[PDB]
Structure formats: C-alpha cells, structure tokens
C-alpha cells in the first residue's frame, strides 16, 4: 500500500476506465509506474490532505499495484 499524504496543488491521476469511483487515486509515482497511464486518465489537482490509493485491491477494476509496489 502506498497511502501517500497528498500536500495541496500536488497532481494526482485517476483512471475512468478501472477506478470504482471518481475519488480514486494515485500519486504521480504510481500513476507513471502503473497500467493507467495508457488509459482514459483523468489528472486532479490535490486540495490536500487526499491519499494514494495504489495496492488497495477495492479501489481498481484492474492494475490495483503500480510497479514500484506490487
Ligand atoms: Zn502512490
Ligand atoms: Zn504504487
Ligand atoms: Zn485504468
């Protein structure tokens, strides 16, 4: 599990095609490292205080691990 603690204006990626929901995330780390930078990806801007959602099997339709943590 990653469950990094996002820092306002930070840029984090969800995916529309696997996430469960809209508030589904990664870092900029996984992201890059992850199946969904081929995907429909959509970037959001940190307000602060949200957290990386890589290695949460609930939140993913599929890729839930980014390299770095699978
Ligand atoms: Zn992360
Ligand atoms: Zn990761
Ligand atoms: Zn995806």
Redesign the pocket.
């Known amino acids: 599990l990653c469950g990094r603690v996002f820092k306002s204006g930070e840029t984090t990626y969800s995916?529309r095609?696997?996430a469960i929901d809209p508030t589904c995330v990664l870092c900029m780390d996984c992201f890059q490292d992850s199946?969904?930078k081929n995907?429909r990806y959509k970037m959001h801007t940190s307000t602060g205080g949200g957290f990386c959602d890589c290695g949460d099997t609930e939140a993913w339709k599929?890729?839930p691990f980014c390299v770095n943590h699978e």
């Open positions: 995916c095609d696997c199946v969904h995907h599929t890729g």
